[PDB]
Design a protein around this ligand. Structure first.
Ligand SMILES: CCCCCCCC(=O)OC[C@@H](O)CO
Ligand SMILES: CCCCCCCC(=O)OC[C@@H](O)CO
Lengths: 244, 244
């Protein structure tokens, strides 16, 4: 089946995001597209895969500054439904009351700051980071628009905006950098396979001290105590394989 | 912008994939949808994140059996363009001749087995596995269809088919299982942060031998030599966090 005005909307937005230049342009276009769907505020959170124990959650938003501060103050992240992929279908999640039954103080606090309606689309990025694009309005008024239309528009928006920010190396999306050589990564592959410094020397046909140097060298770059952190981080973000 | 016959195609296919029951039903529906787009053969490959050194590549296809055997014989995977995410735009990749300049023997071998035209859509799964859905026909004939239509149809097909196979725990998509408890995973979080068995005991307020047991216990389950493999695998597949 085919029927094209959305197909043209798609084409136009792909080009527009590709021809951007600044992270400020990105934020601005989201702010625009949200208003095009009659949403007042937007929001773009990014759950990083690392650190494992205290996951970095970078974000930028045009929310009321008072709300951003309050949300952080009472740490609602720990209970926020819309930042929990389990609640999503097709990477889409509509805001309703029943969704916040376990996080009631967040639900009331958000209303007290003018966030009465909303919606969130999400996507996992090549660096295994979870990107969440949330729209919100202060009007409980009914804005009728086809559900299928909304999903696909946001499906594209959340993707191309974060893909842009990655091409621009923005701090919001960029995982901790680890500029490793091809040999360094080769050594780290086997390290994650559980191979010892001794065994890796045999495979690569090099001195056992040469392996230990590379290992300590990588640790130094990213400031890590042992090879376990280096390898786990490298595996957690897909450096051992896939994209860069 | 909105215009709905595709939106209805979307809705219909979402339900159909959700109400499935067997991995044979999935394969069959792809085979069907490929023929609906005038493609003779399909193919569904899945690059696993682990093992790191010899990445498992499971697949199932209705290709000529002779071709599947030949492709494996001369190991064309190592040079196959259509299974390399770097060549993709919007997770979509059209087959053309210039794409195979570095893999000429594959290009000729594939033609010798009746694969003259094709296309591939790809997607990364929650377990960090890369799923590749390829369609191919034996007719060099021109089948005119809107590019934008093809992309979005396949964008949905590759997703919902692999998401189905995961709900069914199929061997093609399922990463190596590691049924770990909440405490076991808690210990493994810190292990990947580079924390020693001694330090982890201090944080969790438990014996240092208790930590070592959990560690050896996890190793036993997945048959691993040391904690480094357990943690790296657990991080590589997103067990320490995100989905299950
Ligand atoms: C956490 C980013 C700054 C605070 C904005 C909250 C991010 C987000 O979109 O949350 C919306 C819902 O939680 C509403 O309850
Ligand atoms: C590798 C799965 C079995 C062999 C089929 C090849 C998988 C795939 O779709 O490859 C197509 C292109 O490489 C054509 O040159």
């Amino acid at each position: 089946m085919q029927d094209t005005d959305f197909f043209s909307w798609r084409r136009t937005m792909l080009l527009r995001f590709q021809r951007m230049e600044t992270a400020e342009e990105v934020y601005h276009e989201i702010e625009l597209q949200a208003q095009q769907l009659e949403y007042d505020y937007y929001s773009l959170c990014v759950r990083h895969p690392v650190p494992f124990t205290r996951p970095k959650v970078a974000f930028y938003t045009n929310y009321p500054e008072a709300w951003v501060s309050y949300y952080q103050a009472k740490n609602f992240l720990a209970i926020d439904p819309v930042l929990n992929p389990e609640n999503f279908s097709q990477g889409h999640l509509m805001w309703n009351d029943d969704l916040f039954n376990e996080a009631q103080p967040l639900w009331e606090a958000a209303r007290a700051h003018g966030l009465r309606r909303g919606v969130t689309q999400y996507l996992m990025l090549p660096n295994r980071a979870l990107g969440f694009l949330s729209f919100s309005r202060c009007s409980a008024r009914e804005i009728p628009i086809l559900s299928d239309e909304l999903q696909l528009k946001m499906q594209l928006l959340v993707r191309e905006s974060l893909m842009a920010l990655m091409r621009l190396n923005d701090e919001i999306v960029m995982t901790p950098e680890m500029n490793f050589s091809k040999r360094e990564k080769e050594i780290l592959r086997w390290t994650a396979e559980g191979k010892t410094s001794a065994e890796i020397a045999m495979i690569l046909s090099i001195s056992e001290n040469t392996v230990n140097f590379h290992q300590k060298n990588m640790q130094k770059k990213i400031n890590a105590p042992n090879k376990t952190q280096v390898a786990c981080y490298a595996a957690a973000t897909g450096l051992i394989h896939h994209h860069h």
